[PDB]
């Protein structure tokens, strides 16, 4: 397992199930590569706080107050309800996007491993 | 506006049933008896998400399709001048009401099978007369009952993600003008213009893209944050994940569906909840105005700790599946003792045969005798209910309207009334005659001299109890016809009539009846701690203890 | 043969947890206090289908991933040539045991984070000493721990399918697993089940020999109606997660009243503060006062428990080992002896002294004329009870430090000290306290039908009813 990495490519899977792993692989990019994205890491926290003042529109700020006020009529528990999304932007263009996603992840992550592609149909 | 009746014909295990209802309804019963099939008849009648799929072969009674399915719901509209829900009904059904003061309304469902299509079509009708129902008008996938009724169904297997996603079309999807923060949204747009042109680090992913050459509220996830911690764990337990879904349904009912009539169909809300959360949910169900119309199914007595103004429906089996209903109100005279009667009666609602005893010493002695004789009596539906001495009307009418067998074992008491000496009040006979609906008897005068005091006063009162029990023999036989077992003097004299040789052997006294009644609770534990197997069978097989033989349900006596 | 201890050094919501166990363990607690996380610590240690996926970031305490997850389980193994499961362990352990320590065993789990592959590897070790633990030998996907323990995890029209799944699981455990040690892990068996079936499952769970080893998480009191020879684990709802254990046994003296005891305590196990009252008249009066003053006392963790004709030790030991606050309100009595005249034993003071850890006092005798007697014998015994309460004062202060509230005569004289003008108004008699003694179940209902607001606050704010302020728990500091 320390030498071989097998990438299995099937067109029946979509971009969402690889994209859910890519939500933590973005954090692997920001931590890795001997802090090459450390020039961007102070201003990727600027993009992280772009997702902080989406919490102060009043359609979200009304929900954050009224759900907690509906929840605290049972036992007055010491809870809080928060909301977060954490998205990112980039049956043939999804597949051609996922081919470049697999080639990009093979170029970044697996420089120390032998990569074997199993491309089925 | 009030629900009055439902009548279900040929739907699943119901062949022909008729159940009176109210706004707040609680359904309870055994397993595989049809509590979920009762709630799905309301889902096929009033919820449009199940009605569009039609009926299969398995929705018919004993799987044959030669009988039609007919479900009729009756509403009462006698409070049109004060309630706004009645106007919400009448403003959609503006042509089908017949008389000028029609206070009833009927919403019906009929279904006949198609063997070539193998399909069960559902045709809905409404009106004010039962023989003159007209078809509901509709255009496309929408008829006119969807403009009046919103049905919220809460299953036991809620998933917070799924519910939030499906409802995220209602919240977070409004324009609302400007909301006084548009330059903050311009700063959202301006800081996205300094990230799309310089994402290359030191030209490692800009060069990777060189070689080949807004509304982001879709994936928002609600979390529960405890105070004092800042982390966001995705794994949460099923206690708070249920109650956040209940809060989201309450918020969507109080915001998006203010124009409609909201009906809750809740299946088993005690699942993965604590006891105190069940008591808090019971108080919010039966006191506050959040749930005005609900139909509740449950298996837990802790959700019935706060019940008032409630139709209780019990589904059971005698020959077929039959549902017995009862309208539950606590009176003004029981308003100070309401919580103790609710905590007593809420466990006795889930039984088959209930023995109503008068204190804890009877519970100690009867639990010893049923521990030694029939130890699986509560597996088979038996229950012992502590009344408290005074409350025989409320328990017997609540258990008798639901089809639960009530058994009463009680004493013959004399009450010393307030302010007068020598004139005493008949108590146990007055309670058992008020159980039959008759008038209370007049008070009696007992001449006790002042020098006679102590055991001889108790002996004269016991001889007067023997004389009064001898006088009313036909009333005692009329009580014994209706499973009321009045003792002659006390419980301990009937216990001395059965095992009195062993009571003289254990207590080492010439008067073991008086030593049992000197301290009632601690000497009963001493009698229970020295009883044998033969003495418990001598109590159980006796004539004077037939209430235990009625409680075990056998035909031995 | 027997489990002894589990030491969860680090997991999700456990920072340092050490729990004494047994066979037949039952774990209860509040909502979101890691009752499930405890059952996943047994699944990650013993079951292989959970252990084959490793540990994520979220399985560490406060998402730290710099500390080591360690779960250590202790087995007893004290006997030989009677128990067959001990030979089933000794056969696979082989030379991992030492004669000097041949009656203890340890199975440990270690996990350290990688932070490059973002994966948590699980290394299992077994040994007869806590130092020098060696690794479990394994061939392919199977190590040698899977040749000993088989773990059955249960998590559920409806109702009868769950009982049919119980019959399928018990039939597979009886048929296919004769050569293995079977551990059942049951997650909430009160779900979609009638209460008669809950009492039947409790009788089968605590009486039959088919469930030799289980860990049971529950929310229902009706699954604890038959509990005997069991271990009770409670997870406390404080800001630090504390787990408390009690070894529950019912003695030979309490075997004739076992049913009542179990039923009553089964609902009192799910509380936070339990007030132990004597009878139903105290239940009528305290339910009226706690309805008129603090009606959400049952929501916040209060409970009223009627204990009659019992020496208080079973309830106080069971609720004290589990970390539940117990408050006792009681009155002193003078019980006459059988076959003896004029000799009274001091019953309530002996109950409170046996709770404190002392011995029973001597039997007092009185020279009352007896030949001439009447209502005035009750005032003579009340004067003797006042002299008993005057003589023992530092013992009453020692009871008052341990949340035991002994009355001077009765509850009724303490009620007459607070609202006695209202008792003179309602009962219209010169002796209202003597009138309620004639029929306790009837005149208490007649009393609480006629009290209102500012009588219940005068009961609640009185210094002779401080047990209600202990049960509510509103502290001034
Ligand atoms: N409501 C809409 N408004 C505008 N564009 C839309 C809308 N719905 C879909 N689209 C566009 O149409 C596309 C749908 O592609 P579609 O699946 O029809 O292509 P295709 O030729 O069948 O694909 P393939 O050859 O890969 O199977 C979406 O990717 C999107 O760009
Ligand atoms: N079409 C049908 N014809 C006859 N009987 C049926 C039909 N469909 C279901 N049943 C009966 O109804 C039972 C299921 O009832 P249901 O699931 O409503 O019970 P329940 O009271 O909700 O149960 P629980 O409380 O244990 O979950 C089946 O076991 C069967 O006996
Ligand atoms: N890695 C972790 N670090 C810290 N706290 C965690 C971690 N994982 C889970 N938790 C916390 O542990 C609790 C998880 O709830 P859990 O399912 O263990 O409780 P429960 O008592 O079984 O609940 P329920 O009554 O709903 O079944 C939550 O409070 C959650 O925040
Ligand atoms: Mg069901
Ligand atoms: Mg849980």
* DSSP track, C414-434: HHHHHHHHHHHHHH-SS-HHH
Gap from CA of B300 to ligand 4 centroid (Å): 13
Count of Cβ atoms closer than 10 Å to residue B285 Cβ: 22
Residues A60 and A83 sit within 8 Å (Cβ to Cβ) = yes
Which residue among B14, B36, B300 has the greatest number of ligand 2 atoms within 8 angstroms of its CB, and so is best to mutate? B36
A61: nearest CA partner in chain B: B172
Structure tokens that stand for B314 in this block: 């019990």
- Residue B151 DSSP one-character state: E
Strand locations in B227-381 (E): 261-267, 294-297, 310-317, 321-328, 353-357
Binding-site residues of C for a divalent metal cation, please?
278, 282, 362-363, 412
Chain C interface mutation, best of A21, A25, A30, A75, highest count of C Cβ atoms under 10 Å: A75
- Which ligand minimizes its atom distance to the CA of B224? 3
Task: Name every residue whose Cβ is closer than 8 Å to that of residue C453 and which is 6 or more positions away in sequence.
Answer: C292
Task: Name every residue whose Cβ is closer than 8 Å to that of residue C358 and which is 6 or more positions away in sequence.
Answer: none
Three-class SS of residue C134? Answer: strand
A36–B contact, CB cutoff 8 A: yes
Task: Name every residue whose Cβ is closer than 8 Å to that of residue B356 and which is 6 or more positions away in sequence.
Answer: B385, B387, B392, B395, B396, B406, B407, B408, B409, B410
B527: nearest CA partner in chain C: C256
Task: Name every residue whose Cβ is closer than 8 Å to that of residue C315 and which is 6 or more positions away in sequence.
Answer: C265, C268, C274, C276, C305, C307, C326
The rounded radius of gyration (Å) of the Cα atoms in chain A is 20
User: How many Å apart are CA B341 and CA B387, to the nearest integer?
Assistant: 8
The alpha carbon of residue A75 is apart from the nearest alpha carbon of chain B, in Å, by: 7
Residues C275 and C304 sit within 8 Å (Cβ to Cβ) = yes
Q: Does residue C61 line the site of ligand 3, with CB under 6 A?
A: yes
Considering only CA atoms, which of B77, B70, B110 is closest in space to residue B93?
Answer: B77
Structure tokens that stand for C144 in this block: 């040698």
Cβ < 6 A, ligand 1 pocket: A 91-92
User: How many Å apart are CA A29 and CA C379, to the nearest integer?
Assistant: 88
DSSP string, A36-79: GGGTTTTTHHHHHTTTTTTTTSHHHHHHHHHHHHHHTTSS--SE
Residues C6 and C41 sit within 8 Å (Cβ to Cβ) = yes
- Residue B136 DSSP one-character state: P
Task: Name every residue whose Cβ is closer than 8 Å to that of residue C251 and which is 6 or more positions away in sequence.
Answer: none
Three-class SS of residue C137? Answer: coil
Which ligand 3 atom lies nearest to the CA of residue B224? 31
User: How many Å apart are CA C354 and CA C227, to the nearest integer?
Assistant: 25
Considering only CA atoms, which of B445, B443, B446, B417 is closest in space to residue B430?
Answer: B443
The answer to whether C118 contacts A75, with C-beta atoms less than 8 Å apart, is no
Residues B405 and B353 sit within 8 Å (Cβ to Cβ) = yes
Backbone angles phi, psi at B166, to 5 degrees: -60, -30
Count of Cβ atoms closer than 10 Å to residue B52 Cβ: 9
Residues C344 and C366 sit within 8 Å (Cβ to Cβ) = yes
Residues C236 and C245 sit within 8 Å (Cβ to Cβ) = no
Tokens 């920001």 belong to A30
Residues B367 and C259 sit within 8 Å (Cβ to Cβ) = yes
The rounded radius of gyration (Å) of the Cα atoms in chain C is 28
Backbone angles phi, psi at B385, to 5 degrees: -115, 120
User: How many Å apart are CA C377 and CA C347, to the nearest integer?
Assistant: 18
Task: Name every residue whose Cβ is closer than 8 Å to that of residue C259 and which is 6 or more positions away in sequence.
Answer: B367, B371, C225
Asked if residue B482 belongs to a known ligand binding site, the reply is no
C69-75/C230-235 β-pairing: unpaired
| Atom 11 of ligand 3: nearest residue by CA position | C13
Which ligand 3 atom lies nearest to the CA of residue B238? 26
Nearest by CB: B184 against A39, A53, A71: A53
DSSP count for chain B of H helices, then E strands:
19, 22
Three-class SS of residue C4? Answer: strand
Task: Name every residue whose Cβ is closer than 8 Å to that of residue B390 and which is 6 or more positions away in sequence.
Answer: B431, C441, C442, C445
The alpha carbon of residue A30 is apart from the nearest alpha carbon of chain B, in Å, by: 11
Residues B279 and B309 sit within 8 Å (Cβ to Cβ) = no
Task: Name every residue whose Cβ is closer than 8 Å to that of residue B39 and which is 6 or more positions away in sequence.
Answer: B27, B265, B267, B295, B297
The answer to whether C299 contacts A28, with C-beta atoms less than 8 Å apart, is no
Residues A36 and B202 sit within 8 Å (Cβ to Cβ) = yes
User: How many Å apart are CA C176 and CA C377, to the nearest integer?
Assistant: 73
Binding-site residues of C, please?
32-36, 278, 282, 362-363, 412
Three-class SS of residue B250? Answer: helix
The answer to whether A50 contacts B217, with C-beta atoms less than 8 Å apart, is no
Considering only CA atoms, which of C138, C108, C104, C145 is closest in space to residue C125?
Answer: C108
Three-class SS of residue B87? Answer: helix
The alpha carbon of residue B219 is apart from the nearest alpha carbon of chain A, in Å, by: 5
- Which strand (E) or helix (H) includes residue B224? strand B221-226
Tokens 């000290």 belong to C417
Residues C312 and C351 sit within 8 Å (Cβ to Cβ) = yes
| Atom 25 of ligand 2: nearest residue by CA position | B31
- Which ligand minimizes its atom distance to the CA of C159? 2
User: How many Å apart are CA C331 and CA B369, to the nearest integer?
Assistant: 30
Residues C43 and C55 sit within 8 Å (Cβ to Cβ) = no
C57: nearest CA partner in chain A: A24
Q: Does residue C15 line the site of ligand 3, with CB under 6 A?
A: no
Asked if residue B492 belongs to a known ligand binding site, the reply is yes
Gap from CA of B346 to ligand 5 centroid (Å): 26
User: How many Å apart are CA A65 and CA A40, to the nearest integer?
Assistant: 35
Q: How was this structure determined?
A: cryo-EM
| CA C67 remoteness from chain centre | 33
| CA A84 remoteness from chain centre | 12
User: How many Å apart are CA B288 and CA B275, to the nearest integer?
Assistant: 19
Tokens 């036992």 belong to A75
Strand locations in C9-129 (E): 17-20, 25-29, 69-75, 105-113, 120-127
Considering only CA atoms, which of C82, C62, C61 is closest in space to residue C71?
Answer: C61
- Residue C409 DSSP one-character state: S
The alpha carbon of residue A114 is apart from the nearest alpha carbon of chain B, in Å, by: 20
B14-20/B294-297 β-pairing: unpaired
C239–B contact, CB cutoff 8 A: yes
User: How many Å apart are CA B287 and CA B47, to the nearest integer?
Assistant: 26
Backbone angles phi, psi at C214, to 5 degrees: -145, 155
A76–C contact, CB cutoff 8 A: no
Q: Where are the alpha helices (DSSP H) in B373-507?
A: 392-400, 428-435, 455-471, 473-481, 491-507
Three-class SS of residue C337? Answer: coil
B379–C contact, CB cutoff 8 A: yes
Structure tokens that stand for B93 in this block: 């059904």
Structure tokens that stand for B154 in this block: 């809460």
Strand locations in B88-211 (E): 104-114, 119-127, 134-135, 138-139, 142-143, 149-154
Gap from CA of B36 to ligand 2 centroid (Å): 7
Chain A contacts of C299, Cβ < 8 Å? Answer: 75
Three-class SS of residue B522? Answer: helix
The alpha carbon of residue B330 is apart from the nearest alpha carbon of chain C, in Å, by: 14
User: How many Å apart are CA B397 and CA B548, to the nearest integer?
Assistant: 21
The rounded radius of gyration (Å) of the Cα atoms in chain B is 33
Residues C97 and C133 sit within 8 Å (Cβ to Cβ) = no
Three-class SS of residue C28? Answer: strand
The answer to whether C192 contacts B299, with C-beta atoms less than 8 Å apart, is yes
Gap from CA of A94 to ligand 1 centroid (Å): 11
Count of Cβ atoms closer than 10 Å to residue B71 Cβ: 23
Residues C76 and C3 sit within 8 Å (Cβ to Cβ) = yes
The angle subtended at Cα B506 by Cα B503 and Cα B509, nearest 5°, is 75
Residues C463 and B452 sit within 8 Å (Cβ to Cβ) = no
C120-127/C105-113 β-pairing: antiparallel
Backbone angles phi, psi at B117, to 5 degrees: -80, -20
Backbone angles phi, psi at C373, to 5 degrees: -155, 175
Q: Is the dihedral of CA C7, C8, C9, C13 positive or negative?
A: negative
Chain B contacts of C221, Cβ < 8 Å? Answer: 275
User: How many Å apart are CA A34 and CA A15, to the nearest integer?
Assistant: 28
In DSSP terms, which residues pair with B60 in a beta bridge?
Answer: B11
- Residue C37 DSSP one-character state: H
Considering only CA atoms, which of B267, B287, B327 is closest in space to residue B21?
Answer: B327
Count of Cβ atoms closer than 10 Å to residue C289 Cβ: 20
The answer to whether C299 contacts A24, with C-beta atoms less than 8 Å apart, is no
Q: From residue C168, how far is each of C171, C176, C196 by CA, in Å? A: 5, 12, 21
Tokens 């009659």 belong to C308
B310-317/B14-20 β-pairing: unpaired
User: How many Å apart are CA C258 and CA C253, to the nearest integer?
Assistant: 9
Count of Cβ atoms closer than 10 Å to residue B298 Cβ: 21
Considering only CA atoms, which of C383, C448, C460 is closest in space to residue C414?
Answer: C460
Considering only CA atoms, which of C473, C406, C466, C412 is closest in space to residue C285?
Answer: C412
């Amino acid at each position: 397992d320390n030498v071989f990495k097998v990438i299995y490519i099937n067109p029946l899977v979509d971009l969402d199930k690889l994209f859910a792993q890519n939500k933590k692989y973005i954090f692997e990019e920001s931590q890795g590569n001997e802090s090459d994205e450390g020039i961007l890491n102070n201003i990727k926290s600027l993009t992280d706080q772009v997702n902080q003042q989406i919490g102060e529109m009043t359609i979200i700020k009304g929900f954050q107050q009224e759900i907690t006020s509906e929840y605290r009529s049972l036992k007055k528990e010491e809870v809080s309800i928060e909301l977060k999304s954490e998205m990112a932007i980039k049956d043939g263009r999804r597949k051609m996007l996922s081919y470049s996603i697999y080639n990009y992840l093979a170029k970044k992550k697996y420089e120390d491993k032998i990569v074997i592609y199993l491309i089925e149909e | 506006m009030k629900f009055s009746n439902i009548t279900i014909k040929n739907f699943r295990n119901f062949e022909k049933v008729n159940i009176n209802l109210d706004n707040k309804n609680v359904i309870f019963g055994m397993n595989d008896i049809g509590k979920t099939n009762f709630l799905y008849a309301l889902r096929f009648l009033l919820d449009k998400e199940i009605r569009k799929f039609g009926f299969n072969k398995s929705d018919y009674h004993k799987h044959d399709t030669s009988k039609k399915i007919e479900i009729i719901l009756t509403l009462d509209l006698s409070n049109y001048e004060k309630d706004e829900d009645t106007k919400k009904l009448i403003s959609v059904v503006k042509g089908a009401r017949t008389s000028a003061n029609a206070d009833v309304f009927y919403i019906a469902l009929e279904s006949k099978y198609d063997d070539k299509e193998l399909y069960g079509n559902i045709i809905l009708k409404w009106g004010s007369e039962l023989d003159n129902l007209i078809d509901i008008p509709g255009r496309g996938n929408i008829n006119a009952l969807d403009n009046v009724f919103k049905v919220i169904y809460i299953n036991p297997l809620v998933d917070l993600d799924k519910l939030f996603a499906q409802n995220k079309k209602y919240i977070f999807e409004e324009s609302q003008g400007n909301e006084s923060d548009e330059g903050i949204l311009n700063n959202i747009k301006s800081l996205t213009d300094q990230v799309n042109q310089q994402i290359g680090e030191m030209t490692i992913i800009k060069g990777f893209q060189q070689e080949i050459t807004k509304g982001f509220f879709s994936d928002i996830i609600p979390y529960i944050k405890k105070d004092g911690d800042s982390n966001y764990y995705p794994t949460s337990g099923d206690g708070r994940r249920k109650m956040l879904s209940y809060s989201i349904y309450n918020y969507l009912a109080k915001k998006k569906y203010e124009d409609k009539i909201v009906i809750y169909l809740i299946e088993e809300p005690e699942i993965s909840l604590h006891r105190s959360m069940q008591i808090a949910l019971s108080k919010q169900l039966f006191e506050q105005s959040t749930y005005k119309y609900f139909f509740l199914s449950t298996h837990s007595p802790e959700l019935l700790y706060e019940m008032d103004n409630t139709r209780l429906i019990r589904v059971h089996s005698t020959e077929k599946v039959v549902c017995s209903s009862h309208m539950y109100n606590v009176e003004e005279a029981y308003g100070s003792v309401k919580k103790k009667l609710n905590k007593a009666l809420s466990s006795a609602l889930f039984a088959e045969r209930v023995l109503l005893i008068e204190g804890p010493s009877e519970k100690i002695l009867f639990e010893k005798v049923l521990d030694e004789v029939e130890p699986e009596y509560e597996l088979n539906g038996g229950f012992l209910l502590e009344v408290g001495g005074t409350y025989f009307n409320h328990y017997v009418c609540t258990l008798n309207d639901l089809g639960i067998t009530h058994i009463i074992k009680t004493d013959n008491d004399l009450k010393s009334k307030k302010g007068k000496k020598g004139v005493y009040e008949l108590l146990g006979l007055n309670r058992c005659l008020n159980l039959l609906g008759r008038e209370n008897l007049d008070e009696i005068t007992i001449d006790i001299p002042e020098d006679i005091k102590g055991k001889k006063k108790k002996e004269r009162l016991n001889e007067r109890k023997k004389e009064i029990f001898k006088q009313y023999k036909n009333e005692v036989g009329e009580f014994l016809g209706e499973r009321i077992y009045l003792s002659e003097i006390d419980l301990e004299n009937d216990l001395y009539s059965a095992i009195g040789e062993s009571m003289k052997r254990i207590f080492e006294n010439e008067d073991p009846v008086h030593y049992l009644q000197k301290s009632k609770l601690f000497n009963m534990v001493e009698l229970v701690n020295n009883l044998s197997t033969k003495d418990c069978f001598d109590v159980f097989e006796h004539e004077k203890f037939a209430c235990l033989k009625e409680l075990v349900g056998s035909d031995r006596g």
